[PDB]
Amino acid sequence: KVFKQDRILKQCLDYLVESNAAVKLSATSIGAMLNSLAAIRFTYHRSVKQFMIAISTEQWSEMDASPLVKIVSAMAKLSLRLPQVLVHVGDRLLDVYTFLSPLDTALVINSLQSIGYGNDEVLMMLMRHAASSARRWDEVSLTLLFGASGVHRLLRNVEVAAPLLEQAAGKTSSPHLRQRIAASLRRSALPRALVQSSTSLLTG
Amino acid sequence: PLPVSYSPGSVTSTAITAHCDVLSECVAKADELAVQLKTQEGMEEFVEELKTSATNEMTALVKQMQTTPLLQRAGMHELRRTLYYTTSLKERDWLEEKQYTAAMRMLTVEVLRRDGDGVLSADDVLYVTTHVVTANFYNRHLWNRMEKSLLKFSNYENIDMSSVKAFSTRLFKTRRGCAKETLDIRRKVLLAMSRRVGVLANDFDLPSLLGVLQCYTVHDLTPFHLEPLAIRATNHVGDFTPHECATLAHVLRKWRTMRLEVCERLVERICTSDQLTHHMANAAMIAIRTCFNQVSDGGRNAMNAEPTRQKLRAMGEQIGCRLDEVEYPALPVILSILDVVVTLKIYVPKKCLQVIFSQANDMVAIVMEQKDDPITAEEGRQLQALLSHYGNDLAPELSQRMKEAFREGVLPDEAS
Amino acid sequence: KSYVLKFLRGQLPEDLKDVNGALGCLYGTLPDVDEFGQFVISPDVVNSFHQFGYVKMPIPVLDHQQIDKLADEVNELANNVEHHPKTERLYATSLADLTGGPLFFCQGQWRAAWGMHDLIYLPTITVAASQILNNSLVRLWYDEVFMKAARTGPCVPWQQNYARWQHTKPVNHVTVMIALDTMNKDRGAPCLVPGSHRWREGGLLPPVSYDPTKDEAHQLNTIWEIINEEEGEMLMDTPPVTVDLRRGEALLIHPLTLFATHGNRSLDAVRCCFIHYMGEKTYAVQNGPLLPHTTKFQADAMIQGPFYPVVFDPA
Amino acid sequence: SHLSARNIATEALQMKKLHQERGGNPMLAQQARRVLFATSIAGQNLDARSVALLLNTAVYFGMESDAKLVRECIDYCLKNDKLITVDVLPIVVTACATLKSRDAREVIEMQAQKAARNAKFLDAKDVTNIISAFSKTGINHEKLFAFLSRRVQTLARVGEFEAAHLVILANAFSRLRYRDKFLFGAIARRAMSLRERVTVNELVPLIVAFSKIGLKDPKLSKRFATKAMEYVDQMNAEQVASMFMAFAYFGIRYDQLFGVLTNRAVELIDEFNAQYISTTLNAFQRIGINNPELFDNLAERALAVVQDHDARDISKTVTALAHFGLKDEELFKRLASHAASIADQFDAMGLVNTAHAFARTNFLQQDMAVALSERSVYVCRLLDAGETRRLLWALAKFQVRDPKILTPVFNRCLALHYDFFADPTGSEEIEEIFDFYGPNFCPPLYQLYISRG
Amino acid sequence: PSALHLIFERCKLNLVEFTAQDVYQICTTAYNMDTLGMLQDPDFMRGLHDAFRRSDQTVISPFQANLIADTFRKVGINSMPKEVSVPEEDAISPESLILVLRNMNITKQRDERKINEVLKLMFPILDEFSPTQLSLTVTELARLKSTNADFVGKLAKRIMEYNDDLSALDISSAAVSLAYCPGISHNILYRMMQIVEERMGEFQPEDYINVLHALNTLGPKFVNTFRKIVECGLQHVENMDAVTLTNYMVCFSTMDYKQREHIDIYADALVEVATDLSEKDLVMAFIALQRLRLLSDTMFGTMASCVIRYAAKMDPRNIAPIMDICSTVPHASDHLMKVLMDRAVECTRILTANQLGDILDILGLYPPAREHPLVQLFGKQARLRLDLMGPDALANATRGLANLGYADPEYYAQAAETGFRYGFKDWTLLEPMLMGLSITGQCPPTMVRVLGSHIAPMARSMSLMEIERANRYLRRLGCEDDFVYKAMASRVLQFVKEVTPEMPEDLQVLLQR
RNA sequence: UUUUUUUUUUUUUUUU
RNA sequence: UAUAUAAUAGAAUAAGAUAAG
Lengths: 204, 416, 315, 453, 513
Hints:
The structure is cut from a larger assembly and holds chains A, B, C, D and E.
Chain A: H1 6-18, H2 27-38, H3 45-54, H4 57-61, H5 65-77, H6 83-96, H7 102-114, H8 121-132, H9 139-146, H10 151-154, H11 158-171, H12 175-187, H13 192-202
Chain C: H1 43-52, E1 54-56, H2 64-77, E2 92-93, E3 104-107, H3 116-120, H4 123-132, E4 138-148, E5 156-159, E6 173-179, E7 190-192, H5 216-226, H6 229-237, E8 241-242, E9 250-253, E10 259-261, E11 270-278, E12 310-312
Antiparallel strand pairs in C: 1-9, 2-3, 3-4, 4-11, 4-12, 5-10, 6-9, 6-11, 7-8, 7-10
Chain D: H1 5-21, H2 26-37, H3 48-60, H4 68-79, H5 89-98, H6 102-117, H7 124-136, H8 142-156, H9 163-175, H10 181-193, H11 200-213, H12 219-230, H13 237-250, H14 256-267, H15 274-287, H16 292-304, H17 311-324, H18 330-341, H19 348-360, H20 366-375, H21 385-398, H22 403-415, H23 417-421, H24 427-437, H25 443-449
The structure holds 2 RNA strands.
InterPro entries (chain E): ARM-type_fold (IPR016024), RESC8_HEAT (IPR058977)
Protein name (chain E): RNA-editing substrate-binding complex 8 protein HEAT repeats domain-containing protein
GO molecular function (chain E): RNA binding
């Protein structure tokens, strides 16, 4: 209903935190609640921060891929930056990255960019996995990936950015996204020849 | 016969007078309870009951004014007291926004209608302007017409003393945090009545004399018509309390009337106080500096300039020895006093310097270790230079504290 | 003349009527005296107006950006927290009591607003109005704007324009309605009788009594109360028609046609403009001014002056 | 013409300059108004300079405070107060001078506080522009004026200003009614130190300002009189009338200068317009000099051209002619018939002056009297007791006896009865008024009048 | 399309209750696909804008609101997203004031009172900030051009405290944002540059760009850090982007790098790939190369050839620098110069006073510009712009028009009056006016008197050759005041104390008078 | 041509 | 097995009469 009464949800979250119920809830339930809170731009971030902190490392250790990506996406859309939640997220990603769908990979990459994630190994290996499975990427997934804030940071190697660029040239058909990708290629650290060829393909 | 519709501002009594009498009595009783206090919950109960009674009375008045064409049948004095009570109950928080706006919109409409007729006397204009701008209720046409009608100085020539004093106090009291758009019209109200104040110079009593002078000065207005108003005060020193002489010195300095002869008397009168304070000492030091800067080494009496400075220096020492009794609220007062002493080479005892620097150390022992909360870096440098000039043995703690503060960087810059 | 200060040499006069012609705002400028032939209305439109007492122009008379400008000016006229400058230049306004209401109405706006002043001199509507009045001189009398509330805009009851214009001697008038918004039966489109302009050989029905504390049904149904049996027989065959207007659509209305405006039940305000044009050889009836603070005429003096400017003159 | 907002502000400023000091071409004003009507800065980001220029050019060309561009510019000035530096402060102040909204007042007060705080760090250009801008708003911040006057004196002690700066400074400090004799002495000294660099065009306005400010010192006027006497030959009618007015304002009886000025004025009698004739007659009335040949020449020229007579010109001319005594027959008829046509332009006091001048000379025309009487209902609110008495006596001599016209005048008289009945003069005037209108027309004023107070 | 028509009609009449998210979705599908006539239909877009204005925009991100406003402005509807208020006492969190600042920055509508309010609600709760939140709020405050340096200094100290928790990008962004703040302390800047150079082996090209911008802003007080980065980047010089090479050139020009050994390597690397530069980057590279005295015979040709493809549509603010570079350099640039003159002729309408003055000044002594048709157009435009010219722009324009032989006595007389209104302070601000008048050799005597009264005080600080030129101008104009010649002869006496016939005729004539 | 500047001022007794 | 991401800046510049206390 896009209903915005944040006092009611604040009372509900206070009851959730006080009852120590965040240590027994399911991963998909946590993701659904966080996504619902983020979909309406919840105001009181202190309650959400306490609720996310209260959950234990046991839950973080064996979360499935999709609830985990939902949780990190809801964290990113709520402008939450937590130093100790992100290390748990990173080790869980290290464990279960191979099962991510392409749209999950794009969501993870752009959400981690949106929160200014400082780790580079996890980002680099996620980008490598995305490059390996480039032949299956849809249109919305490419928009989500190449629409990330610091996308040019991730376009480090030619191997990790060649199939993604050719797939974007083949599939993406929006002038603004192509211009943004060309600008990111210009600001990237790729070899000059590949940048020139990709810019030629995308624009013109 | 012509249908004139002019009624004196200060017969033709409608129900508005009966409505306002109840409010007057209720407000008087609610005020008397405050004096009786000097059972807080108990008296708060009576206060709440009186507030509810006044709210009901004002609701009835507003409904009567809206439903019935009472304003046209009303006189002028009742309209003015209705405006007074409508503005006064809001600052006392006995009315809501809706009722207050509904009453004041109709008040302004009726005032504008009477202005269009032309029955607004030279006193009603001042009354409405002062009781509207101080309440900060904005109506474009009313404000513009009042500001335009306050420029006919020929009308405001024979205003009564009591009305002058009432407007002066009303504008003076609520000056502290007034909105900026009100300042210009405040100055216009003050200046429209300036000539009448000038011809009233030989009639004020001394506390009201300083009240009017401070009211004009705080509104950054120093009109020439009020020139005698200050002069009499200069010629009437010795009847003022010691504290008031500091404000008198500041006013005289801002009025280009501070000279050596009056400065001697002002310093002497300050020195008759039982115990000095920061205000009196600061004003005395500033006055001494101002008079010391008024002597020329190549003027008419250039040969006689050297003794005068000496005399002033002596008077400075008179304040210099009584510099421990005061309590400095902020560092700038200490810095100004010390700068005035050093620049004029005034002699200060070591005990006074010790007390001053101890208070300064206790003051700066708040900004750096608490760090929760505005001493700028240049002020700290000036304090360090002063301490070094007078010797670091005075306050050994302060020197190290300032040095570690400057190394740490707690003190911000002036640009920030 | 006198000496104007250097920083005041570009200011416009207090009264905008003092401007002899039209400002450059909105449309560029009035064309040449021999370039007015491209705004002529079709003869079929004239016949339709003479048969029905009303007609809507084939094309919108204003481009969209001009419509946005006019809507912004209407919004600024109805300001309450900061009252409009030149408010005392209006004949009458709904904010004279400073409170307001669901319906905001403003008269004599052309003396206190740019753009609205230029709207008077629009060739597209003035040429058509002149064609309506047997191809003669046209003089602006006055204009007004209505703006309805967001969801509680009231409906104007049935009315005849000439019922209030009793100071003008002959029946020589025309009304132009410009819709600054998109209107509908639920939003404020005008509903008028298809043939009421030729009833009683030109007479006027008595004033209609309405209760301002109820819904729209009785307001629109008072027409039966105010008419007689024969008028009912005429009305039954041709019921009143509500014309839906888009942005910039102009509607020419006879002064004797019965018309009303539906209330606003949309989710935001709706604005409309009425401009009343006389013709030449239109005379007064009684001494004194027709409008508040206007020129005082004689018993049968012809209507002219700066308050009623000439906006189009054939030959 | 599609252009960026900065590229539009630049051409707008150029158009303002050309329409201001290079002839008032109406086409330039219309083009600028059309260009600024469609201009908006809601989305694009601009410097404070561009926004200030747009606001100033919009306000100059007749745009009130209800427009979109003015509202956006005022919102920008209210929000980003720290980006409006001293360089772009006078532009904003001048733009807000005419506007009298609440936001305009707040902006003006904030700029005044900023200028008063930073009054010691400015230069000749900044100080001159700031004082000129604050002259136009009618503000009454005396502390700011004192600070700026002190800075002016210190900056001019080293010979910084020049002719144009001195003219602007004197005009600004005279319009604000700041009778600082030391400041004007410094300005005069800087002017006299500018040998042969103060031309006639830069000398006449200085004398006009020094006359208007009303300085007590009479030694200063002598130097201006001599320098004007040297410069008479190089003058048009404008400056001749200007110095007639100026030396009437000074009030010192000079002889050689007046003779040479009269010679030059009668030389240029074929170039005088309505305003120059009115100014000359008013100056002669103020100074008291009786010059009947020049009065005859001016009356003949005023008879030659009557359409150019504005309400101010008409009022000054009739008042001067009535006070002097000399009066023509057909010239008065033409002036009255013309004032009947433009009776809707008279001010609060100009109307009273014109009506009383026509009544005092026993010249009664029905059309003019009716027009002035009917117009005398929107101006009674803005009348002092003396002006109200004059208007009431003019109406009594005109025999109006119309309640709709009389009751506002009597309301004003009752609302100002103390200043009305205690006037040192006019007792016979009030006696004649009450003899005409009788006791029963207005009871309360009669009861007050038979009480002498 | 009966259903589509009904939906459009119901949207037009404002009878559909729209949420902010629904309006955002409609805007996205209209801007992306636009298969239907959504953007082309004005009434539907007006209705959608009316729904969006009255909606509740708190439930959308600042980016979404910005996109909605951009979509509305693309069609003509002047739209502007609502301003968000400062959070209340309960919602005062480190993650909400940052959101306020971010929305203020993104929507491009900054209120300084709101900035102060959110800077006074951040100090008590400044201990709850994450290490990345400080690096975010520093850049957000820098992008708002805030003048509060104490708050940024405290933030920088905290950022230094959490050094190990921040990535290279955060450190570089904090460094450049700190460098952009004007009033910040210098000890903090030194500490930040030490931190940057300690963690400098992990930098991406973006971090290199940020560090170079920070160094260029700071100036030649930070030479050691620039030397360190130059020594480190020498390995990557061949495999390097063009923009960062241009920034290296700009920093080299700014710091006055005396080690001219690596400058050659970096300049050659830049000129190799100069083909991939835009307008501003190419202009900056030109200026940096000129100020480093690097324009050789061949690299100038390549850079000019690169400029040729851009000279047709150059901005009016990028024409004068290239003209100056061509003027100073002694190589062949006739074709580029002609193209630039044609572009200036095209742009003469929109050129401001300063740009027109610079263009006229550069072409003052250019031989081919004598017969080019720009002289008359620029003279007329300068006469029009003479009201807006400053004390120096007027002098530059007058000098350029006098050197070109443009003869119009009215323009020079108006320039004389404008100069008299402004006043003169240097001889270089008065000589162009004198030669412009001497071109026609006629002016009213009052003009001569004012010019002589201006010249006379200035005669005590002129060289002998300038005295000769001033005497020539005064003789051509026809002055007769004696004190001016007295002062000129007094100044001449000092340089040549001998009245011997050795000096030329003009000198004897001057001392005689 | 030699007069002047640099505070947190808060104390006016009306029934409007 | 899900309905969706959005941030790069450049310009130094002065017009001038209100029927007062």
